[PDB]
Amino acid sequence: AAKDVKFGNDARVKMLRGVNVLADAVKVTLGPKGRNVVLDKSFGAPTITKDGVSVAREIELEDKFENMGAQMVKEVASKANDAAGDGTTTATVLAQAIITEGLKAVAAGMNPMDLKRGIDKAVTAAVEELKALSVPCSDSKAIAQVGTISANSDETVGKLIAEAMDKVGKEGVITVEDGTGLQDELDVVEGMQFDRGYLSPYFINKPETGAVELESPFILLADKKISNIREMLPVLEAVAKAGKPLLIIAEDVEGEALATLVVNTMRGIVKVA
Amino acid sequence: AAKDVKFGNDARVKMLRGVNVLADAVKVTLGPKGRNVVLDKSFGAPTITKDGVSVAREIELEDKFENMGAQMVKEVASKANDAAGDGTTTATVLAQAIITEGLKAVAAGMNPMDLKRGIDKAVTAAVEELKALSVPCSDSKAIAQVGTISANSDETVGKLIAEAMDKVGKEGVITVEDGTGLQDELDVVEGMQFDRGYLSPYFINKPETGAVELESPFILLADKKISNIREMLPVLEAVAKAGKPLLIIAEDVEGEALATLVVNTMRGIVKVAAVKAPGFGDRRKAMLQDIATLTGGTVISEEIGMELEKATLEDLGQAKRVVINKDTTTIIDGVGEEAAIQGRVAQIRQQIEEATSDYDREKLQERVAKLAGGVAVIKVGAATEVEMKEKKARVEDALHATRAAVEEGVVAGGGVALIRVASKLADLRGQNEDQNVGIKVALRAMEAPLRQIVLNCGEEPSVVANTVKGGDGNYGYNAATEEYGNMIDMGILDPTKVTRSALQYAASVAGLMITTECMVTDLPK
Amino acid sequence: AAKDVKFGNDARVKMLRGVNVLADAVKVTLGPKGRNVVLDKSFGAPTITKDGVSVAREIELEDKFENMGAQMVKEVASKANDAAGDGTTTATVLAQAIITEGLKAVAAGMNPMDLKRGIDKAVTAAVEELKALSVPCSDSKAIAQVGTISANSDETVGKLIAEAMDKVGKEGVITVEDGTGLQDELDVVEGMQFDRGYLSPYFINKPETGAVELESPFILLADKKISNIREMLPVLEAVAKAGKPLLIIAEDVEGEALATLVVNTMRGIVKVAAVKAPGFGDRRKAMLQDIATLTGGTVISEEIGMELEKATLEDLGQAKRVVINKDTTTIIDGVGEEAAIQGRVAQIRQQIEEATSDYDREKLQERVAKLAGGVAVIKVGAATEVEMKEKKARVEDALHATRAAVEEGVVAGGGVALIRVASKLADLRGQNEDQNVGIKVALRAMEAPLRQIVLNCGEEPSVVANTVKGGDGNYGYNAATEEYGNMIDMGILDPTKVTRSALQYAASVAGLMITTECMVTDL
Amino acid sequence: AAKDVKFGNDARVKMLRGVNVLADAVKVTLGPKGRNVVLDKSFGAPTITKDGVSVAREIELEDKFENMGAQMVKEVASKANDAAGDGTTTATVLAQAIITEGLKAVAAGMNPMDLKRGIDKAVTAAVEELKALSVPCSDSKAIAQVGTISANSDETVGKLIAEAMDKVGKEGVITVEDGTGLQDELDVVEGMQFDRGYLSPYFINKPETGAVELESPFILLADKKISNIREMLPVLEAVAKAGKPLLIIAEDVEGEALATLVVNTMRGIVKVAAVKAPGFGDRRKAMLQDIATLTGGTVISEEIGMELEKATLEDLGQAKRVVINKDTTTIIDGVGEEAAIQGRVAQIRQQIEEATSDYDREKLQERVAKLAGGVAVIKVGAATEVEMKEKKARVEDALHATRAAVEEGVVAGGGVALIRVASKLADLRGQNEDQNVGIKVALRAMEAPLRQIVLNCGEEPSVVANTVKGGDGNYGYNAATEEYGNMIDMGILDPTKVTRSALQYAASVAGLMITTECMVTDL
Numbered sequence A: 001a002a003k004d005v006k007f008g009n010d011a012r013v014k015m016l017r018g019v020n021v022l023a024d025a026v027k028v029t030l031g032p033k034g035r036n037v038v039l040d041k042s043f044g045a046p047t048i049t050k051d052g053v054s055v056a057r058e059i060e061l062e063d064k065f066e067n068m069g070a071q072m073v074k075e076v077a078s079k080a081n082d083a084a085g086d087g088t089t090t091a092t093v094l095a096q097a098i099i100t101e102g103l104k105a106v107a108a109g110m111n112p113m114d115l116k117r118g119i120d121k122a123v124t125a126a127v128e129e130l131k132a133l134s135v136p137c138s139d140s141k142a143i144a145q146v147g148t149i150s151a152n153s154d155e156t157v158g159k160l161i162a163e164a165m166d167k168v169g170k171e172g173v174i175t176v177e178d179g180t181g182l183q184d185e186l187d188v189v190e191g192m193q194f195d196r197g198y199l200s201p202y203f204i205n206k207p208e209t210g211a212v213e214l215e216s217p218f219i220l221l222a223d224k225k226i227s228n229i230r231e232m233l234p235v236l237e238a239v240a241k242a243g244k245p246l247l248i249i250a251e252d253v254e255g256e257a258l259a260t261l262v263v264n265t266m267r268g269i270v271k272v273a
Numbered sequence B: 001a002a003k004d005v006k007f008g009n010d011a012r013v014k015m016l017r018g019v020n021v022l023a024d025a026v027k028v029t030l031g032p033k034g035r036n037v038v039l040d041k042s043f044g045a046p047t048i049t050k051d052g053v054s055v056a057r058e059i060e061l062e063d064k065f066e067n068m069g070a071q072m073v074k075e076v077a078s079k080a081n082d083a084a085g086d087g088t089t090t091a092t093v094l095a096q097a098i099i100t101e102g103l104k105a106v107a108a109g110m111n112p113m114d115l116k117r118g119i120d121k122a123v124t125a126a127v128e129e130l131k132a133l134s135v136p137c138s139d140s141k142a143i144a145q146v147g148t149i150s151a152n153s154d155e156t157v158g159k160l161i162a163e164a165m166d167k168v169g170k171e172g173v174i175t176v177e178d179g180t181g182l183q184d185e186l187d188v189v190e191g192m193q194f195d196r197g198y199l200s201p202y203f204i205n206k207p208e209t210g211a212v213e214l215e216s217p218f219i220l221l222a223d224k225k226i227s228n229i230r231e232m233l234p235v236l237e238a239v240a241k242a243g244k245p246l247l248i249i250a251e252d253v254e255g256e257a258l259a260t261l262v263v264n265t266m267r268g269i270v271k272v273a274a275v276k277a278p279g280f281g282d283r284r285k286a287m288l289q290d291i292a293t294l295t296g297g298t299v300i301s302e303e304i305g306m307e308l309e310k311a312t313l314e315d316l317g318q319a320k321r322v323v324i325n326k327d328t329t330t331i332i333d334g335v336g337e338e339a340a341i342q343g344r345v346a347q348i349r350q351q352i353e354e355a356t357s358d359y360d361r362e363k364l365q366e367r368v369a370k371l372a373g374g375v376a377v378i379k380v381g382a383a384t385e386v387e388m389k390e391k392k393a394r395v396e397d398a399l400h401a402t403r404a405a406v407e408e409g410v411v412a413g414g415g416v417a418l419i420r421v422a423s424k425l426a427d428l429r430g431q432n433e434d435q436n437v438g439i440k441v442a443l444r445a446m447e448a449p450l451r452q453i454v455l456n457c458g459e460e461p462s463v464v465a466n467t468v469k470g471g472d473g474n475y476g477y478n479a480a481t482e483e484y485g486n487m488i489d490m491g492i493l494d495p496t497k498v499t500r501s502a503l504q505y506a507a508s509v510a511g512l513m514i515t516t517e518c519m520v521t522d523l524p525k
Numbered sequence C, D: 001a002a003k004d005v006k007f008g009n010d011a012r013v014k015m016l017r018g019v020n021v022l023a024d025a026v027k028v029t030l031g032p033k034g035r036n037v038v039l040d041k042s043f044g045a046p047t048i049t050k051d052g053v054s055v056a057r058e059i060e061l062e063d064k065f066e067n068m069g070a071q072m073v074k075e076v077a078s079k080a081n082d083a084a085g086d087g088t089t090t091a092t093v094l095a096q097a098i099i100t101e102g103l104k105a106v107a108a109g110m111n112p113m114d115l116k117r118g119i120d121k122a123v124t125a126a127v128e129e130l131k132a133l134s135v136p137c138s139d140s141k142a143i144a145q146v147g148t149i150s151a152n153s154d155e156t157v158g159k160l161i162a163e164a165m166d167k168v169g170k171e172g173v174i175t176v177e178d179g180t181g182l183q184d185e186l187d188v189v190e191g192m193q194f195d196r197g198y199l200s201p202y203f204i205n206k207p208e209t210g211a212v213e214l215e216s217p218f219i220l221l222a223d224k225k226i227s228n229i230r231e232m233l234p235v236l237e238a239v240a241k242a243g244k245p246l247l248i249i250a251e252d253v254e255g256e257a258l259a260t261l262v263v264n265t266m267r268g269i270v271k272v273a274a275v276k277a278p279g280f281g282d283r284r285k286a287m288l289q290d291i292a293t294l295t296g297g298t299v300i301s302e303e304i305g306m307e308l309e310k311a312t313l314e315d316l317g318q319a320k321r322v323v324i325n326k327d328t329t330t331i332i333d334g335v336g337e338e339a340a341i342q343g344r345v346a347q348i349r350q351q352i353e354e355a356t357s358d359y360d361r362e363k364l365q366e367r368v369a370k371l372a373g374g375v376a377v378i379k380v381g382a383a384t385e386v387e388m389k390e391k392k393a394r395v396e397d398a399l400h401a402t403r404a405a406v407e408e409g410v411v412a413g414g415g416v417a418l419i420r421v422a423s424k425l426a427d428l429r430g431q432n433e434d435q436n437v438g439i440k441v442a443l444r445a446m447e448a449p450l451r452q453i454v455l456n457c458g459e460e461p462s463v464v465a466n467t468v469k470g471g472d473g474n475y476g477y478n479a480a481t482e483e484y485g486n487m488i489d490m491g492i493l494d495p496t497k498v499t500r501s502a503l504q505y506a507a508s509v510a511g512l513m514i515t516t517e518c519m520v521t522d523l
């Protein structure tokens, strides 16, 4: 319906209030001495965590403008997350510092475009200086150390990543699985990796894991577009008679086949990814 | 329900409040130093953009009267967008300036009808002066420059448009596609273009793209009206058995067939897109024969005896790709043999030779032109599918602005075009004091875009505008480097068509809406 | 206290709303078709008055900015009433029109100070054109016409004023008072007049007219200033049981040893007034002797030696009525002795015959003119109280208009003269374009009284104004007969002093009022 | 009382909002295109005034923090009016500009103490540059130009002031008073002036001007201080029925045995004033004798032996008018005897010829200068009351500007001089970077009066300021004709005292106000 327009330093201060709220919530958890943040869950016990990703993802404010400044900072925090894998709290703390001093400077009347030009000039110099300052991590010991630090100071995880990196070399493929035994296990078996995502987000069996894990599935290889699901009807019949998950590799998938597969997955009769 | 009327200067001030809100929101983004505007999205992250189109389309106010003043200015801004391809912010800034000074003058008691007569007199003189001031853009370098400026100062897009412009000549066909590689690609293949829109807006596969893009579709050619869908039932069965998108070209489509096809499209069982048959009579039939030759299809007519029910997969034409724009449909890499296309070209060239009527001869000439020149395809190359879609949109509207510059001309951008037009029209008078005030309103309001650009740069708009007025010719203020100079030397150019259309529609809405007294709307409920 | 501050067009439209309120209340009384306005009063009954200045004075608005606008325009009517006593409604309408057109021109972006200069130049030229266009008033028939037109087309009032000016002369004093029967009466009685005012503003009686009246006053005179209260207390003491209010005429009356304790002594049952004596030295002694002989009293002096303690009730003078005004103090009717009054007049006549100095001759001739003219008293007849006050106000307006006519002259009535002198100024130009716009504002506004008269008639004002502008000379539109004719020949005359003062004051105030950007008031 | 406490930028933005309110109300009156402001009054009609200091004074805001900001800026206009009487609007605009840019620099994180030091250093250097750039005023044509420009481009005012200084000399006393006709009148009458003030603040009359005026006062003089009230009661007693207000000139007047019971005795009908006598001993006796002869009165002394009880009304002096001000008390017109006044002037002249001591010669020459110069009285002609008050205020501003010009000098008008001395100070630097930022704040603020004048014209202030900065010398932008030219040649001149005082006071107050972190007020 009708929509509210707010501009000027009033909009900037509403937005700054929002980003201050979000950055407070997630910057509480920064570092190894990061204080716990409790996300009050709608069901059961409230989840308590020091995960900046988990804390940031849940923040949304009652006022629309504060909410939406928080939304932008959270979105770029998640952009730094999936770009790297860690450092959401670091990204949000840096964002809060830069935005606080920047909007304070803009309220002092300095030109925001020139101010941004100064900011990105300085961060470009910072990026090149950091590249010059960077130390290679080809050795296994620093690999184990960074794997430890990333997993909340767990030496075992960094260790396992170290033997995995030794096993598959510098640019090999490493995949995590669940083991029945209490001890950690490591194996090397010939496999495949190719960079393609799922057609639909509903194909994920575990939304918390974020990946479609299928055990003993039938894999179909196709170089043609699946325009109609009638091509997939005998495949569905065969995989339902056999009774195993189904994986499909095709050139393109049109709206019809994808919608039918989404309906089938909602039905619970086949597992098709 | 019941409805609330407001008239007099009260309605005009509610209207003015609304147009001030909308024009503020969109004029923040004017120029290359346009400040970001954040559109709060109902889901996920908000879209932060400097696109005056996106900001304007988003604005709607809580008060009905302010809302509807904003609706009027937004609608005429979008009208200038579709007419030209760019310059919504320029159109809205001009509209705000003219409307502000005009409503102020009307509150000073001058006759609104005479004031509008002054406004449209001044803008008619401005259009004539801008035509006189326009510089042709037949050269490739200014074409690349305007393609760059249209796509937010991207030299690569202007470069690609330049090579496509060289490929297809002065009036050729250029179409944007997506490429797999990170590098940009350019190809030239024989194709088709005809100016017809989709039957229904739901036929668009991508509402954000706005065009129906079908890859390897079956094309049906018909010269008869599809009154019943029972004629399309065997076609639907065949295209569902084959499993490809379907394109339909027919004379007319009635409510029954269109409704059934729309229902099928919500069903998701078939991809059917229908377009009208362009042209009329014998010219229509001949060009449909040309399209059938291009795609290997067959034209179905009631007068011949051929029926739509007797449809086989061989009879329908086929092509590698088709794209249906708002009112234009193009075909890329048709299946039909190039030798048959050359034979058809020779036949219509002999038709040109035997042509005696000027209209028929020019129709045959444009037919042989579209059959012989072909279509250039620019495949966007980048790393991410996201930036793929933004660069595809940038190439689209940049090439639209580029062809706008090509068809009419180009003038030194940065708003100095209207500045020079205003400086060269200071002596235009009106038949009385009211029309004279209208002239003065329009002349002082043509300086609004340059002032707004400079204001977004943070400088003082008054001194910069006075210095630009003091200079003569193409001398103005480069906002990008924040330095003065000649735009043509430094490649800051705007199509004559976009500035002319923006000014014309801004003056149109301002004159049409200054003379508004009564403002009827529903009660706030 | 906290001050609300408004800027630019906000302040200007609040001002204009207040001005429109006040000037519409005033303007519904303009012309012979003008309608009376009922003014509320708490102490007495409501007053149904057609007097413009009364309505203008009593307009006080709740909205403080509109209140300031109304007060500034009310100053126009007050100053017009001060200078002329008639034409307050014309002055207010002209002020409204100048304000409206000037605010339109300001909204058109024109410079307001230049508009004020243009308005003032146009009005200076228009006053010069009125002086050129003015016709002297004489024959006592033009006087009757002026009186009738000034009194809402009341011919009896015009004839009565004409008879009064025929009796006491064109410069003799005339006093309008409440009547006794239904009919107005003319009494050419013996009295005194002198241009002096009251010393203290606390001498104002219950009426708001500003002139204090005494019922059968007791007259005391002096040329040498007394020293102590105790020398003058016995006189008051005698007056304290005389029965008659006391009026003292002296050189100059203090506040310290008279005013404070004369306020503190009584609560206001019977009032005591003190006034200055005109002239100085021998002349002042001469007028004091003349007034004492007129009232039958005596003058205390150092040379005589007779003292206020020795003065009795019979020694001092007595009058039937005295009305004191700031501009001029007049003793209405003093009994004295008619034979003694005649003897004093004759003695002053041989004083004229003996004297040869120009100053002495002119002052003695003023003395004999004042003594022979006497006082004309007009009894305003009406059936009820509010009708009496309304008719008294109309007769007062007629009197002031006739006096303005004899002082300065007459022109065409019904705003025709302003129309003509505006037409004659169509070529007037200033230093720049904004001043020319102000001149045009003034010229357009000068048409406003005529259009307002025609509006009060109910006819279309624009066609009538265009018709009147079409002709020339004293041709205009008689509102009473709703038809076109010669203004002078049909008897509709306006005092040139009244019209000139109205235009000047409206021009000054409105040209100041259009130039305001800010207004500062309370919350 | 509960005190609201605000800290830092909250207090600073509340202050700035109040400052913007007051300084905008003031700044809409700047320049020849400046517009009047309507001030509400309860006792009288609203005053339409262009006087900047008045608009500054009656700004009082509801928001207590904004009120405090407005009061601190109002101090700028009040001090400018005190020192110079003109340029209050310029002072307020400069104060606003310094406050605005200094608060911007504070929000930029710079040290406010250092900003204040930089501002004060820049303003000291700018005052030196103004002294260097100042041109002496003479020829009586520059005087007319100064008067005209100071009075909103009123050439009649400038010519009248020029004639006044040509009559009574460049150092003679001139008094501006309410006129009687529509035209201003010049009266070179005989009077006295002396630099003394009123003893008690309860002597202030109904006008808020701070100078108490007396209508035909009665003069009493003394050199030896009296002891008891009873010795002086008969004099009052005589005055208590004389008719004229009493002005006493003595060595030093108490509050105990005069002021309390003179307040308690009368309620304020006729006012009594008491003032100090200039000089001491023989000099004080000499000026008392001179004033007594000017007014026709006598001086009581121990050596003479004549006592106040023996003094009568005829023995003491009398004047036509007296206006008493704290800075200088002037007797406007004392009748006395013209032959006696001439004889006293001649006697003082042979006293000059006989005397040879430098102090005696200079004081006797001051005596003859005061006696020969007399008093210039200017009757401010206007049609109505509010026009009279506005024109009187403008003529007062012109008078104060001309006096400042003859005291100190003139510079280019229209803020051009401030522009030039800012350009000459572009190389000025302080002890650190924050002081340099304060200097830049001051220099940018000196451009503000010119840009505000141009804004009141309605032109683009930035291009006009840049054009004026482009030129050199007295080249500026004549706002009246909206054209660029030599400021001296077309006569736009500003008193160097006015400009220097405005800059100094705006600098001091604004440099103090930019440095506030906290504000403590009521709830």
Ligand SMILES: Nc1ncnc2c1ncn2[C@@H]1O[C@H](COP(=O)(O)OP(=O)(O)OP(=O)(O)O)[C@@H](O)[C@H]1O
Binding pocket: B029, B030, B031, B032, B034, B050, B051, B052, B053, B086, B087, B088, B089, B090, B091, B149, B413, B414, B415, B449, B453, B477, B478, B479, B480, B481, B492, B493, B494
């Ligand atoms: N470097 C530059 N210096 C000066 N003016 C420039 C420069 N680059 C672009 N402009 C001007 O800025 C305007 C372009 O602004 P912008 O791209 O934000 O919007 P638009 O072209 O008016 O339309 P839309 O917002 O609908 O895309 C044009 O008037 C163009 O001439």
Ligand SMILES: Nc1ncnc2c1ncn2[C@@H]1O[C@H](COP(=O)(O)OP(=O)(O)OP(=O)(O)O)[C@@H](O)[C@H]1O
Binding pocket: C029, C030, C031, C032, C034, C050, C051, C052, C053, C086, C087, C088, C089, C090, C091, C149, C150, C151, C152, C153, C397, C412, C413, C414, C415, C449, C453, C477, C478, C479, C480, C481, C492, C493, C494
């Ligand atoms: N019969 C008439 N025809 C035309 N004009 C008339 C007639 N009678 C009076 N007038 C005009 O009307 C005005 C007098 O009306 P009115 O007395 O109500 O107003 P005023 O003189 O402005 O002052 P006030 O209302 O205070 O007495 C004058 O301009 C006079 O010329």
Ligand SMILES: Nc1ncnc2c1ncn2[C@@H]1O[C@H](COP(=O)(O)OP(=O)(O)OP(=O)(O)O)[C@@H](O)[C@H]1O
Binding pocket: D029, D030, D031, D032, D034, D050, D051, D052, D053, D086, D087, D088, D089, D090, D091, D149, D150, D152, D153, D397, D412, D413, D414, D415, D449, D453, D477, D478, D479, D480, D481, D492, D493, D494
């Ligand atoms: N015609 C003119 N052109 C340019 N500047 C002018 C002109 N007339 C006056 N000025 C300038 O305007 C100022 C005078 O305006 P104004 O009198 O309103 O303000 P002020 O001197 O600061 O004090 P105040 O408002 O209290 O009288 C001076 O700076 C003077 O030089």
